[PDB]
Amino acid sequence: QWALEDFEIGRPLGKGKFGNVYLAREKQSKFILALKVLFKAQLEKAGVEHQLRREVEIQSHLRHPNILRLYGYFHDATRVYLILEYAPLGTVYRELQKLSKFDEQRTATYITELANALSYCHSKRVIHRDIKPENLLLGSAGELKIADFGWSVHAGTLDYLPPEMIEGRMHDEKVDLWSLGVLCYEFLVGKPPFEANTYQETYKRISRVEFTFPDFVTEGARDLISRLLKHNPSQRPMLREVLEHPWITANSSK
Numbered sequence: 001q002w003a004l005e006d007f008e009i010g011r012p013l014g015k016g017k018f019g020n021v022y023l024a025r026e027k028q029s030k031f032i033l034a035l036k037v038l039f040k041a042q043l044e045k046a047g048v049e050h051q052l053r054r055e056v057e058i059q060s061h062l063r064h065p066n067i068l069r070l071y072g073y074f075h076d077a078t079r080v081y082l083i084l085e086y087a088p089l090g091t092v093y094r095e096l097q098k099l100s101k102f103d104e105q106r107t108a109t110y111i112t113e114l115a116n117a118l119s120y121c122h123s124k125r126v127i128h129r130d131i132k133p134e135n136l137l138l139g140s141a142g143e144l145k146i147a148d149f150g151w152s153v154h155a156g157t158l159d160y161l162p163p164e165m166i167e168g169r170m171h172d173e174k175v176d177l178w179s180l181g182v183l184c185y186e187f188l189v190g191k192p193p194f195e196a197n198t199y200q201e202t203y204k205r206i207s208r209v210e211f212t213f214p215d216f217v218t219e220g221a222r223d224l225i226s227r228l229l230k231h232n233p234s235q236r237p238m239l240r241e242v243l244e245h246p247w248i249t250a251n252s253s254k
């Protein structure tokens with residue numbers, strides 16, 4: 001359907017091993033989007049092409065206010081092009097470096113928005129897995145948008161991965177709830193609960209669910225994060241309960 005000659009490329013929005021994402025405008029529509037440029041070259045090299053065509057599937061047949069749209073794709077000789085929705089306010093990663101740490105009302109909100117996106121996703125047996133600040137964009141309304149369904153799956157950094165995944169075990173859609181716990185702690189505190197200097201120490205730390213809270217993290221936050229960060233998937237709340245949690249509700253603007 002689409003082709004490069006249909007677009008006007010603007011400023012780089014960022015990088016990544018496989019190439020860059022650019023702001024871009026569809027010539028005859030004047031529609032603003034983001035062009036994710038991926039070299040076939042490198043996708044083959046690091047054997048991810050099977051992953052890529054899965055990112056396209058899942059994220060394409062997905063439709064949610066809190067999930068970055070993928071409109072389409074195309075290729076030529078040197079590379080593969082993803083036509084992404086453009087999220088005007090950058091990544092939550094950047095906002096977090098910017099503010100270093102969020103407040104309960106902002107955190108609340110993101111968690112909600114996030115919960116909803118994952119609620120919708122699981123319904124379709126889609127499990128994200130790779131939910132980290134770097135992967136969360138912001139709409140003009142300032143609202144969260146889960147990006148990058150690269151690792152995404154049906155039916156590198158350890159920081160966001162739950163015990164089950166890391167240990168090489170049975171994992172379902174509970175992963176995404178552990179992830180939410182980690183996120184939730186990172187937003188309030190400014191670093192993820194299992195941060196360490198080595199792969200090896202992080203592994204232990206996650207493995208044994210060793211986290212502590214700074215004093216300023218309030219009781220309700222401790223509660224929700226404590227319930228989310230369970231070694232055992234079965235004890236992790238359902239998304240519904242996260243939405244229903246009283247620290248969420250007390251604070252979640254959106």
Ligand SMILES: O=C(Nc1c[nH]nc1-c1[nH]c2cc(C[NH+]3CCOCC3)ccc2[nH+]1)NC1CC1
Pocket residue numbers: 013014015021034036068084085086087088089090091137147
């Ligand atoms: O796919 C990506 N990003 C995007 C996909 N869709 N939209 C983006 C995106 N939106 C952005 C918005 C901003 C807004 N800032 C621009 C500079 O001044 C401050 C505000 C920045 C980067 C964005 N990437 N990857 C890039 C992080 C490496």
